[PDB]
Design a protein around this ligand. Sequence first.
Ligand SMILES: *C[C@@](C)(O)[C@](*)(O)[C@H](Cc1ccccc1)NC(=O)[C@H](Cc1ccc(OC)cc1)NC(=O)[C@H](C)NC(=O)CN1CCOCC1
Ligand SMILES: *C[C@@](C)(O)[C@](*)(O)[C@H](Cc1ccccc1)NC(=O)[C@H](Cc1ccc(OC)cc1)NC(=O)[C@H](C)NC(=O)CN1CCOCC1
Ligand SMILES: [Cl-]
Ligand SMILES: [Mg+2]
Ligand SMILES: [Mg+2]
Ligand SMILES: [Mg+2]
Ligand SMILES: [Mg+2]
Ligand SMILES: [Mg+2]
Lengths: 219, 224, 204, 196, 241, 240, 244, 243
Amino acid sequence: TTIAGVVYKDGIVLGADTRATEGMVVADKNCSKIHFISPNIYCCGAGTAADTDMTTQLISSNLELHSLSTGRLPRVVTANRMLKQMLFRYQGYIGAALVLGGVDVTGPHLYSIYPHGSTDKLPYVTMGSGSLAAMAVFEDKFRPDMEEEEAKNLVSEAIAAGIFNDLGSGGNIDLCVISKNKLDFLRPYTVPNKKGTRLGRYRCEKGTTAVLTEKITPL
Amino acid sequence: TQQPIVTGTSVISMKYDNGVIIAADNLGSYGSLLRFNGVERLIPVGDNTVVGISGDISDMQHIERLLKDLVTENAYDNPLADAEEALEPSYIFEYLATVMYQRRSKMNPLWNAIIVAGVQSNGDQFLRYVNLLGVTYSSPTLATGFGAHMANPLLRKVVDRESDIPKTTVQVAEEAIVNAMRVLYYRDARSSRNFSLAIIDKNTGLTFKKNLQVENMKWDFAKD
Amino acid sequence: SDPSSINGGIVVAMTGKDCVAIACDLRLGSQSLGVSNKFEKIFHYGHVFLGITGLATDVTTLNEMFRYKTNLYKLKEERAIEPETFTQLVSSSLYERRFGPYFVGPVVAGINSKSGKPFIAGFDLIGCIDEAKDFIVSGTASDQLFGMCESLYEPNLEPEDLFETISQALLNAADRDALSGWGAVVYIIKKDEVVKRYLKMRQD
Amino acid sequence: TSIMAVTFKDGVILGADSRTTTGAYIANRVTDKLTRVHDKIWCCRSGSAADTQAIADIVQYHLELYTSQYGTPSTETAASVFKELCYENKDNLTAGIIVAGYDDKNKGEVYTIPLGGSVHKLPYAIAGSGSTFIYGYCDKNFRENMSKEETVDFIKHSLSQAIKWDGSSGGVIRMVVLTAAGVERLIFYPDEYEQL
Amino acid sequence: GYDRHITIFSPEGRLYQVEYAFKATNQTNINSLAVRGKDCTVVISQKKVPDKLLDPTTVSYIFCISRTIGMVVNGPIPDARNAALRAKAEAAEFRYKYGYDMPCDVLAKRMANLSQIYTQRAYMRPLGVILTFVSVDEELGPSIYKTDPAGYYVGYKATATGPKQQEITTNLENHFKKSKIDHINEESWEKVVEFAITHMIDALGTEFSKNDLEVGVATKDKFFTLSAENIEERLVAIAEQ
Amino acid sequence: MTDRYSFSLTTFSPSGKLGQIDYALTAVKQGVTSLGIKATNGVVIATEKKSSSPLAMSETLSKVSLLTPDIGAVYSGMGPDYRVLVDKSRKVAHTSYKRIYGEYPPTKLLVSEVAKIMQEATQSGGVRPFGVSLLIAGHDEFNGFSLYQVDPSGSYFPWKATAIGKGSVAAKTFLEKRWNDELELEDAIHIALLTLKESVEGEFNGDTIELAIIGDENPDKGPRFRKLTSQEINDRLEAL
Amino acid sequence: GSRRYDSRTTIFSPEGRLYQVEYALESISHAGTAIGIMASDGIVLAAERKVTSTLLEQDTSTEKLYKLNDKIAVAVAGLTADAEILINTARIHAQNYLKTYNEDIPVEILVRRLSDIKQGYTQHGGLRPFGVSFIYAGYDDRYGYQLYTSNPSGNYTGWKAISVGANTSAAQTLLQMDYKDDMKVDDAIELALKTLSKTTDSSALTYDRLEFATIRKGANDGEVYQKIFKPQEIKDILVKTGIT
Amino acid sequence: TGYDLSNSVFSPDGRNFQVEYAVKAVENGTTSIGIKCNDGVVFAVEKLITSKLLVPQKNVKIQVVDRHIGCVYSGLIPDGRHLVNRGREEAASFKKLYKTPIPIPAFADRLGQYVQAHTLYNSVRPFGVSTIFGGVDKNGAHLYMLEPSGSYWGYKGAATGKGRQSAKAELEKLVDHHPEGLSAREAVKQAAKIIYLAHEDNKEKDFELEISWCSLSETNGLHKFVKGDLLQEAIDFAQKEIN
Ligand SMILES: *C[C@@](C)(O)[C@](*)(O)[C@H](Cc1ccccc1)NC(=O)[C@H](Cc1ccc(OC)cc1)NC(=O)[C@H](C)NC(=O)CN1CCOCC1
Ligand SMILES: *C[C@@](C)(O)[C@](*)(O)[C@H](Cc1ccccc1)NC(=O)[C@H](Cc1ccc(OC)cc1)NC(=O)[C@H](C)NC(=O)CN1CCOCC1
Ligand SMILES: [Cl-]
Ligand SMILES: [Mg+2]
Ligand SMILES: [Mg+2]
Ligand SMILES: [Mg+2]
Ligand SMILES: [Mg+2]
Ligand SMILES: [Mg+2]
């Protein structure tokens, strides 16, 4: 998986590929990896896919209840703590590797969370099999306080690097732009590969398969 | 189950006519790294007992706190805490021996070898050993780890059996202990020059000596 | 030893124009020994269909479990569960055994009764949802099914065109797997009729 | 990791590199390994990043609750809480922590807590993979009651060498100065320290 | 008449043990007041040291719960300390779990929910205290929130608690009716404290020395209580104008 | 400390009355008036913000609570008891429903879960019943708009319109005359404001009234619950 | 301590009665009447709602008739909340039995289970009993059509026709007078409504004050169908039988 | 009425009568006092000699907590011992975690919260003791007194039991006549006098004086019992002042 995030001038840009795999087989070519935590906080997810889905959902649910009780928007630090403390408790067995990004009362914040419960707070991060390919792009071209369309391009360029150079990553590029004034959930942002066109029609004609018996029941 | 990390080496000891002597170097090794050069491994309890500890230093510090806490607890509702109902070497030992064997039996041992040296109410010399397995024994000379192999042979030449204890003076016994500490410094790769020594005598009481050093070192035969 | 390939078997599902299709083989074995050729892997709870491959004791246990849950659902909600909702129920249920899982490969198929939208889905053994429009595959010949489906499939097929596509996908994939086959079933599901067909295939 | 805490005349200074590794990959090159458990009690972290963060967060909680009830805790008290966690959970943890703090009564103090969970109060302390390479240098060059500028130089030179030889250490040298005057954060970049 | 001994309903739909816990609130015979500035929240309370043998430095009903939150209690000291220790524990746990300082109102609601449990569960008695929480919240600004034995809680522009609360309340009500604003329009907390003391003097009709008062002040990022000499400086300024 | 109250504090009297439930209902009677009205394209719920002091900020005290995005609640009786029911209702909507099915519960089932909690306080050891009656308004895809009442017993009933608390007998009669099955949401808000004016003594404006709706989606969906602003109420009071 | 406030809900009186059971039965005597009538080709359940305003939404309302599975239903008399606790327990027991044996639970086994739960609250725990009496209408392939009742004591019995709740004395006499063994469902529908029409404390019996249901095997291919009657359908059957 | 039959029940006043009844058991007990001095504290107690068969100096009433805190109490003696046992557990757990010995204010709240807890439930009885305690910590000397309700404050001087009014009057004179402070050796002498003067309320039976003290200079900040010559010197001073 290639997931990444950057802190730009007005806020946060998150990025992800769309390839889900089993063994060496691609099960889903357009799989969504950018998860909703709260209205101002999203989370990209890599690692064991089930663990990624359920861990974000549980912390999203608990933050919703937290936010209803306090009456104010949740913070990224609390999303970061709740994820961190849970992953630590389970000593790495919950194989979730997250890029957590959001915009608070205190401004924009970006985190990377590891399966063992360590977190780094950074202006740019990358995770998954494609993190090196994506990090190469950030080390080449990142600078602090970027404009929005520039930051979008850099993250898109970093996910692409993962898509093409890493066999674990592929499909489309999803972005999520988060600032004080808006949330832009772009799915897909880019379609870097056209779906391969088939030259023949291999579908069989009616009555080609051999049937033994039949039953019809109405509903 | 653990493994020892920061470790202390030999604790050596012997009986003499009026009391007991105990000694141990001031090193906390971290494998081959001679990490901590100021570690005290003789820990006095009252004015009649010294507990010498080798092995894991974190577990030694734990035992040190248990003994400190034992003194506090014995004082509670005890008007004779500094007299007839003070802590005895035999009481302090039996406690530690109970703890050590309990911990080995839960498969979570205190990774140490301990020698309790002291003098009892009636003037009797107390000297007994206990380790991580709960194994206990007493002898006119006692030594842990490396010292068992090198110190005991030398110290046993002074006190070979029980009947030699009244014949041995404090000067003869202290010389033997300091001599043995030199021999261990030549030959133990996880030892140090700097050590502490403690005499517990039935007449003169507890004498605790810090910052001693191995001296009179023969190296001149090396140049050839 | 590997629980997912003791008993063997396969399930495939596809979408079409105002219809879905789900199909499975009939084999149950103990590795090399074929035992039963009447072990169906597709069940239904109202209008929602569930195929399950993998360890056969878990296939049976989960069927019994989802019948239980969907029955109580209907009593309380006063309506039959929909495919979208049932998919989430399967995922939850599998993930609650995260560190002692059911060794299964479930596949949901059905038509949402209100919207009329065809729906399929698949899961790993701990409940991660594969949420694809085209097709879902599962079992010991999953690789074989992936290849068959990717080259045969196209969108918006009429029910009897789709029947030929899913059937040929199943049959040719099963014939390249030692632990699949021994017969096959295909359900063609429309908004208010369901056609169940047993297929003639080689019995080795 | 290369970390150290050094007492001096006006108080104490903590120092650290900024490298975090996953095998050969530098996962974070600008890491902040100096963390605050109280106003003027800080620690240096080495070992598992997850373990040291989890510990440091628990200590921060304990000292906040201590402060609520009993006022400012001593540096010794902070070290004891770190020790208690590290010793009692020795089988499940990989943490080597240096605790450093400034009282007005006691002035600067440094406590080191190695893998075992033992505590050692020292004039200065070094720890982490890169510390092996500077035992010789630090022992020869350390003096007691140094000035602030001397202690900043002593730490800068020491960690410069630790970084030079240890692949596991690198990046910037961060420092945190603890005196009566307050808390000062210092940073030193490769172009400065490499030419020393 | 056991419907008066435990927390169950009387025929009228009343909880007499809750009502009697409210009466325990005034047993100390101390009046407290709280007001809000622009940048600050001030809480003042009467201090009475009747015994000459008492160490007057230890006689306090104001508590530093967290660095940002302060709490004044109207009620007996054992129940006050019970409530203080819990609020401190709760504020520490919150910061650990959620990574930011517990807001004033969230603590108030939490303590109120605990108070509610004692009104519904029979084995627990209500605490005989009213808790006034104060802070300068980083989202809501200067804040006053109050809790009672019923488990009720609400935010306040200003408030007063004690035997002579109604007199203090009406005094404050009349001032805000003039100014037509929710706060004391003042830059420095020193002048907001002076206002708080002045309006208590007017309402209660008693003069105060430095040892008759106890003051707490919340600013952004810290709550602190004033010393006797800090209050004396405050009393001098009031007298000089 | 042993919680020795392992026995019921609500028991049947010789007449077949459950005393503590009746007494809890008496507490609900003493509480401030609240009401609910169901239109064709929405539901409205409303109550008076009875301010305990003018120094108190009544905006902080919310009598009308969001339970899920499409379900709202209001009450009459003891506020602290209501608050803990809202907390539990919100939580049970996640634990026993959203984390299982991936969607919010329908109005009737969430109501049923709240009713269950209230029933348990009516039979469990060492507790009194809750001293509130709730009015829960909501929408869901398969049942549409709905309005429910929940009493201290745990009993619940669905309503076209109703009122609870202080002036409920008079308010229910007023609603019976005005209600029909062809009301639009604006017509129901208009009737709610008329009905609520009868039971209110003092000031009658957007600052002393709390009023929310379950209506159209406000921009996966948008939430159908909306709390009307102080200004939005006052606008409709001029066309009153 | 706490002993002072304990009502002691699980004791005998000097006469050998359980106080709380007796008082719960008194509570149930004031609840709206429910009637069950078993015919050769089906079972009828009829029940009277209580208090009712013009503003009660009837079509989405369920206070009397509940569904336990596809074969078994209950009519309730007493505290509705208490009944719903027990109903959800019964609904689970039916599904546990289905999961274990792969066969639908026999009616008597379900009834005994619920009745055993009620019994437990009278013998231990120190809690009040459930203030509920059920009429169980069900079918299985051993005994066919079955009617039972249970009450707060945990005692249960089988019936050809039975009433619970208010005016059972009057209701049971009227049923005993007009019931016959060869009777059919359409006739039993008419008997159920006529009995309520006479025993009701209201001025007249109308569609809005009734809940009604039938369990018929009367379906295509000999399968059991539960029919919970809608408001409009209860109004039609009231005109058909000639009550309105 | 019936509000006084059960602990933790509020009367219509807002009072917990069971606690106020515990106070009566405290008032019934022997006189015990505490005096805060320059660098420490002094504790003293009246021990009634019921019979000639009581062994002198053996039935010790004052109890030590940790090594730096002294506790004395009036009322039901076993209830006092129960509280000190808990105090010792609290001090032990504090030192185990935080290393430093428990501060006196910290220790005071530990007893306070525990005593207060025994006024929250009808399943427990309140403590039938007022407890005077204190010692020397990092912030200097502290003297406390803790009542059955859980109430405690800091004191310059403290007194409880049957002779408390007599003692309180004497303590109030010392506070007025020594604003600059009292020395530790002075406080021991004064403690002896105050117990002897407060013995007029228990004058039927003769008594035995017991004194203890923590002082930064005289005991190195550790709790010790006053014994031998220093005790006899304090008794002689007390005997001279009554005559
Ligand atoms: C680069 C890639 C594809 O690995 C990226 O990290 C994916 C992130 C993702 C997030 C949300 C939805 C979908 C995909 N991850 C996957 O596709 C994972 C890869 C993976 C397989 C196996 C293991 O084992 C530790 C880890 C990661 N794919 C899955 O999780 C698939 C759906 N399920 C399985 O492979 C079944 N295994 C069984 C053993 O336990 C782990 C789950
Ligand atoms: C010299 C160095 C850089 O290693 C120093 O000791 C680091 C201290 C540090 C780093 C970041 C914040 C605070 C303090 N430690 C690391 O960089 C550690 C190295 C390490 C890993 C594992 C263990 O023992 C189990 C000891 C040291 N790096 C990490 O913890 C990184 C983030 N995570 C991993 O390497 C993942 N592994 C997977 C296998 O299970 C253990 C964790
Ligand atoms: Cl809460
Ligand atoms: Mg997904
Ligand atoms: Mg085959
Ligand atoms: Mg074959
Ligand atoms: Mg390097
Ligand atoms: Mg109570």
